[PDB]
Amino acid sequence: LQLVESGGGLVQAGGSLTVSCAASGSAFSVNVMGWSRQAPGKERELVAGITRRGNTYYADTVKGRFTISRDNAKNTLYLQMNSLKPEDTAMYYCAALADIATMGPNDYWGQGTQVTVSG
Amino acid sequence: SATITQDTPINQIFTDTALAEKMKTVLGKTNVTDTVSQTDLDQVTTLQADRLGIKSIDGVEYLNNLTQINFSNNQLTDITPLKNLTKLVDILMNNNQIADITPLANLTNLTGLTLFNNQITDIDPLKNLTNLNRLELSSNTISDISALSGLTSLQQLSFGNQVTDLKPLANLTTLERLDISSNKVSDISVLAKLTNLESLIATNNQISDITPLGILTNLDELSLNGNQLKDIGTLASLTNLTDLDLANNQISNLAPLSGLTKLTELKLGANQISNISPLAGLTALTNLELNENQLEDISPISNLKNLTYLTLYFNNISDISPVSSLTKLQRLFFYNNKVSDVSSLANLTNINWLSAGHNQISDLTPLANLTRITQLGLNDQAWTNAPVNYKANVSIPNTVKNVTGALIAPATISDGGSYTEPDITWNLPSYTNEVSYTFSQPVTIGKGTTTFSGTVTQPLKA
Ligand code: NA
Ligand code: NA
Ligand code: NA
Numbered sequence: 001l002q003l004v005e006s007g008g009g010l011v012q013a014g015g016s017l018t019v020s021c022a023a024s025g026s027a028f029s030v031n032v033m034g035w036s037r038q039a040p041g042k043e044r045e046l047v048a049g050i051t052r053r054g055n056t057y058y059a060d061t062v063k064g065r066f067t068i069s070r071d072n073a074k075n076t077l078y079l080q081m082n083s084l085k086p087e088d089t090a091m092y093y094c095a096a097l098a099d100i101a102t103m104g105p106n107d108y109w110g111q112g113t114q115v116t117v118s119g
Numbered sequence: 120s121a122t123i124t125q126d127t128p129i130n131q132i133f134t135d136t137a138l139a140e141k142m143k144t145v146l147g148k149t150n151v152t153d154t155v156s157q158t159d160l161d162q163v164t165t166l167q168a169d170r171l172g173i174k175s176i177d178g179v180e181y182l183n184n185l186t187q188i189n190f191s192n193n194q195l196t197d198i199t200p201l202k203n204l205t206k207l208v209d210i211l212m213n214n215n216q217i218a219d220i221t222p223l224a225n226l227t228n229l230t231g232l233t234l235f236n237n238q239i240t241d242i243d244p245l246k247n248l249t250n251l252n253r254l255e256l257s258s259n260t261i262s263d264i265s266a267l268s269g270l271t272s273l274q275q276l277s278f279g280n281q282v283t284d285l286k287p288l289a290n291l292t293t294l295e296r297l298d299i300s301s302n303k304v305s306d307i308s309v310l311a312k313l314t315n316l317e318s319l320i321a322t323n324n325q326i327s328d329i330t331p332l333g334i335l336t337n338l339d340e341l342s343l344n345g346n347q348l349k350d351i352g353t354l355a356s357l358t359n360l361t362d363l364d365l366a367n368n369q370i371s372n373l374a375p376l377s378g379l380t381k382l383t384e385l386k387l388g389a390n391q392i393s394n395i396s397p398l399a400g401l402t403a404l405t406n407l408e409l410n411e412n413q414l415e416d417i418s419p420i421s422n423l424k425n426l427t428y429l430t431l432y433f434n435n436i437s438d439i440s441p442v443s444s445l446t447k448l449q450r451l452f453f454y455n456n457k458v459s460d461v462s463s464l465a466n467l468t469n470i471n472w473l474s475a476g477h478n479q480i481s482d483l484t485p486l487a488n489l490t491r492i493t494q495l496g497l498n499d500q501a502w503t504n505a506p507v508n509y510k511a512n513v514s515i516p517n518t519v520k521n522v523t524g525a526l527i528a529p530a531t532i533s534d535g536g537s538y539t540e541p542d543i544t545w546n547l548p549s550y551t552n553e554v555s556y557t558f559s560q561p562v563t564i565g566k567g568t569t570t571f572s573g574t575v576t577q578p579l580k581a
Contacts, residue, residue, distance in 0.1 A: 024258060101455075
């Protein structure tokens with residue numbers, strides 16, 4: 001499974017931004033997929049997860065502001081982020097996961113896309 | 120053959136920058152400008168050049184003695200240079216941008232060809248590669264497998280992603296391992312002919328009628344993850360299965376699995392399951408996935424004493440205690456259930472991964488000795504107290520406890536409420552059907568860190 005994040009950018013606080021994750025391979029359609037984020041000198045945080053059926057996990061930090069979705073026909077994962085805050089500034093990454101609500105010890109997060117929120 | 124009659128610089132043969140650099144190392148030279156002889160080129164019989172950013176294999180036609188190549192994970196499009204390398208027996212070229220495989224048509228000594236994750240539609244050039252035993256074409260854009268009908272030495276095959284008609288497989292009875300994942304298949308009648316199959320992977324298709332599988336008794340591995348299965352009666356004949364994946368289907372009736380005692384891995388997530396009594400005899404199970412179902416009573420799992428991985432997230436479970444007999448348990452996932460009491464987890468000290476968010480957990484003290492935990496989830500608990508009478512002044516007790524047994528003060532309180540340990544108090548101007556509060560505290564158990572957090576709802580009677 002190959003994953004490429006895009007759509008990172010600069011937005012002011014209150015704004016919206018969508019990041020996307022394009023997958024190559026048959027595993028996407030039948031994997032739990034998640035978004036994580038890392039700010040410099042901070043620990044990786046699982047932001048959101050989604051099952052093939054469409055059940056979701058959201059971190060407490062983003063619940064009610066972010067929406068994870070998938071288009072299996074396009075092999076693409078999305079994270080729609082509304083009411084963005086400076087604290088949301090990070091590199092955003094997608095990966096296949098074993099669990100809906102936690103990260104494993106060594107997930108394949110690949111390259112990521114930068115999201116910066118200005119106050 | 121392709122040959123030089125004078126020593127020639129490496130970079131005039133191998134015009135791709137990354138490939139010239141690789142060939143400089145292979146041919147034992149100092150610079151990509153150093154000359155090599157045909158005798159130097161004649162030495163190269165294997166070339167492992169994966170994930171180097173190679174755009175062109177121009178020059179490899181001069182490596183006449185190549186038998187095995189790996190150019191996987193590059194940016195190849197044109198593979199014309201392979202056309203006359205008739206000593207090639209194995210090619211690994213997955214994860215490129217190849218569309219045109221006409222250069223492979225006369226490589227009849229090929230026994231292994233790996234091309235998954237490319238842009239191939241037309242596989243007519245493969246039709247005379249009759250010594251192939253391994254052919255991997257998954258994650259391409261193939262809609263027609265007519266070209267495979269004569270590949271009667273195939274033991275391992277994959278393809279995708281637009282195939283509808285499996286009839287070209289009918290005479291390929293040497294097949295042992297087949298992966299038709301991510302096609303447009305409903306009709307698997309032809310697979311009844313493939314009686315040597317040991318592994319069948321068919322995820323993300325449109326299959327509902329699995330009756331053709333009944334005769335495939337040599338199957339040890341089966342995946343039909345992501346189909347339209349409901350009646351799985353046929354699977355009762357597959358008594359050699361050890362590894363079964365039926366996730367993402369419409370299955371409610373597990374009875375046909377109840378005699379399959381060689382099963383060690385059984386994946387049933389995202390179905391219609393409310394009764395797991397038919398799994399109580401599958402005592403060889405080490406991995407059971409039952410996420411995204413209608414489970415409440417999980418007492419049948421108490422017999423499955425070899426379980427090491429157990430997934431149960433998104434069910435209706437309020438009693439987790441049947442897991443207390445699962446002494447080998449390493450991974451326990453049950454996010455989004457109704458568990459309040461985790462006392463039954465206290466002696467499951469082989470747990471290294473506990474995911475218990477969005478339950479009704481108020482007291483972490485039973486988790487204190489799960490020292491092997493490295494991954495932990497405890498956030499977003501939710502529970503509703505028994506109602507109390509509405510009046511302007513409402514007071515309720517807090518009973519939330521962290522791993523040490525200390526009370527956790529509320530983080531937020533609805534309706535301008537306040538906390539004086541252990542009571543939350545509200546001054547309400549008028550009736551409201553509920554008030555609430557949250558808590559949120561970092562917790563580390565072993566090496567695993569999470570937020571322990573929740574929302575407590577207090578209904579008020581008018
Ligand atoms: Na018990
Ligand atoms: Na205290
Ligand atoms: Na209220």
